[PDB]
Design an enzyme around this catalytic site. Structure first.
Site, PDB file in Angstrom:
ATOM      1  N   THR A   1     -16.361  -2.220 -12.062  1.00 22.65           N
ATOM      2  CA  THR A   1     -17.790  -2.507 -12.096  1.00 22.65           C
ATOM      3  C   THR A   1     -18.568  -1.611 -11.137  1.00 22.65           C
ATOM      4  O   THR A   1     -19.536  -0.960 -11.530  1.00 22.65           O
ATOM      5  CB  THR A   1     -18.067  -3.980 -11.746  1.00 22.65           C
ATOM      6  OG1 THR A   1     -17.482  -4.829 -12.741  1.00 22.65           O
ATOM      7  CG2 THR A   1     -19.562  -4.243 -11.675  1.00 22.65           C
TER       8      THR A   1
ATOM      9  N   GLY B   1     -16.033  -6.837 -19.898  1.00 21.53           N
ATOM     10  CA  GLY B   1     -16.758  -7.730 -19.015  1.00 21.53           C
ATOM     11  C   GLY B   1     -17.134  -7.062 -17.706  1.00 21.53           C
ATOM     12  O   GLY B   1     -18.227  -7.282 -17.180  1.00 21.53           O
ATOM     13  N   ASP B   2     -16.224  -6.247 -17.179  1.00 24.29           N
ATOM     14  CA  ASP B   2     -16.476  -5.500 -15.950  1.00 24.29           C
ATOM     15  C   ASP B   2     -17.617  -4.511 -16.161  1.00 24.29           C
ATOM     16  O   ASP B   2     -18.464  -4.327 -15.287  1.00 24.29           O
ATOM     17  CB  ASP B   2     -15.219  -4.754 -15.503  1.00 24.29           C
ATOM     18  CG  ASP B   2     -14.046  -5.683 -15.250  1.00 24.29           C
ATOM     19  OD1 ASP B   2     -14.279  -6.856 -14.885  1.00 24.29           O
ATOM     20  OD2 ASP B   2     -12.890  -5.239 -15.415  1.00 24.29           O
ATOM     21  N   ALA B   3     -17.630  -3.882 -17.332  1.00 24.24           N
ATOM     22  CA  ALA B   3     -18.680  -2.939 -17.688  1.00 24.24           C
ATOM     23  C   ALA B   3     -20.005  -3.663 -17.891  1.00 24.24           C
ATOM     24  O   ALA B   3     -21.064  -3.152 -17.521  1.00 24.24           O
ATOM     25  CB  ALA B   3     -18.297  -2.178 -18.941  1.00 24.24           C
TER      26      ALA B   3
ATOM     27  N   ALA C   1     -21.621  -4.146 -14.634  1.00 25.72           N
ATOM     28  CA  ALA C   1     -22.142  -2.867 -14.164  1.00 25.72           C
ATOM     29  C   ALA C   1     -23.452  -2.495 -14.854  1.00 25.72           C
ATOM     30  O   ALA C   1     -24.400  -2.055 -14.205  1.00 25.72           O
ATOM     31  CB  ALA C   1     -21.110  -1.768 -14.365  1.00 25.72           C
TER      32      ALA C   1
END
Ligand SMILES: Nc1ncnc2c1ncn2[C@@H]1O[C@H](CO)[C@@H](O)[C@H]1O
Ligand SMILES: [Cl-]
Length: 345
Positions: free
Chosen positions: A67, A299-301, A304
């Site tokens: 992220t 999800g991490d993206a 971000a």
């Protein structure tokens, strides 16, 4: 026009080992779809077993690291983001280190004492299931002592935005708790991610305490259900969870708004805040079956994409579109690979 070190991140720097797994692997290790588990003794043979498989993909991982470095990647301004984690004194750790430097990400890695090796994630990919088995390794040795160093704590003090995944609870809860207190004390922006269902089930105390310092909380459907069940929310669990998390009192008891966002895959995501009585749906970009390459790290993206826009003053709806864009970019790529910045749009 953000200052350097505006965004601070702390997490578990890991190496993803992505493999096309056979069907027996999921029965053998008792793995579930889209789920992640920490490696126990019965899981340990999986790492040596996947090395026997051809066409392995090694790529830098870690939820928080993914992220934070994509935020840095999006903003395009060098040294805006900072990251602190613990790696081992091996080639894996140095690869992750150099990967961060290539993205103009300011890092202050802690080096675990040999022979404790850099953590790794066995990413098992198939047509029917996708599952992860995580061996934290060196990531566990992330200490409060390393964080409280003058040359490290200065990164925290000059930051205005923080992102820490719930995964850090297993490695350095004392560190993330201290930063979260510092953030709320100085009225900064603390972003938190539920990360995984097992955290709400087995580390409920830590998750709820972190929420009480968090201004923004990210999560998905499976995490909301796990969270909701433990809190005795047996009906409208996902919706109730969003309302519950948003309504929880802050640690100092002061009245602030907390933004809660719950993604639901192809289905519309949910968002609300403490001052809103309603929970809104946000329809997302639809994918065909032959468009998806790998949803690992979407999800991490998403985090971000949202944060990078939201901290630059862009409104809620616009930021949600940016988050979906970030996720969609990663979804169409193998692992969490940040390609050429020009080809983002
Ligand atoms: N226990 C964990 N702590 C920190 N990051 C993790 C953990 N388990 C999986 N990840 C990371 O999550 C990413 C997918 O969201 C993968 O790149 C993987 O490296
Ligand atoms: Cl992390």
């Amino acid at each position: 026009d953000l200052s350097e070190g505006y965004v601070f991140g702390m997490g578990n720097p890991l190496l993803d080992i992505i493999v096309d797994a056979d069907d027996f692997m999921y029965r053998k290790y008792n793995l579930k779809k889209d789920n992640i588990v920490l490696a126990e003794e019965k899981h340990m043979t999986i790492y040596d077993e996947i090395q026997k498989k051809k066409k392995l993909n090694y790529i830098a991982g870690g939820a928080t690291l993914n992220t934070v470095k994509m935020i840095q990647w999006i903003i395009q301004k060098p040294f805006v983001c900072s990251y602190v984690g613990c790696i081992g004194a091996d080639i894996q750790g140095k690869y992750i280190k150099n990967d961060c430097s290539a993205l103009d990400l300011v890092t202050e890695f802690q080096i675990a004492e040999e022979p404790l090796m850099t953590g790794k994630v066995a990413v098992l990919v198939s047509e029917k299931l996708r599952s992860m088995v995580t061996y934290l390794g060196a990531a566990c040795d992330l200490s409060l002592a390393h964080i409280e160093q003058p040359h490290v704590w200065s990164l925290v003090e000059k930051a205005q935005v923080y992102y820490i995944a719930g995964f850090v609870i297993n490695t350095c809860y004392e560190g993330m708790l201290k930063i979260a207190k510092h953030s709320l004390e100085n009225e900064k922006l603390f972003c938190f991610n539920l990360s995984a269902p097992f955290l709400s089930q087995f580390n409920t105390k830590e998750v709820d305490e972190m929420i009480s310092y968090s201004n923004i909380v990210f999560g998905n459907e499976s995490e909301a259900e796990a969270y909701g069940e433990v809190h005795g929310l047996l009906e409208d669990t996902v919706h109730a969870t969003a309302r519950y998390i948003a309504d929880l009192p802050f640690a100092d008891g002061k009245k602030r708004k907390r933004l809660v966002i719950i993604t639901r895959g192809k289905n519309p995501l949910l968002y609300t805040d403490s001052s809103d009585s309603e929970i809104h749906q946000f329809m997302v970009e639809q994918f065909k079956d032959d468009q998806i390459i790998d949803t690992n790290g979407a999800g991490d993206a998403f985090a971000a994409g949202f944060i990078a826009d939201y901290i630059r003053g862009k409104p809620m709806i616009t930021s949600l579109h940016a988050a979906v864009k970030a996720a969609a970019y990663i979804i169409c790529r193998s692992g969490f690979s940040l390609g050429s910045r020009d080809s983002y749009s």
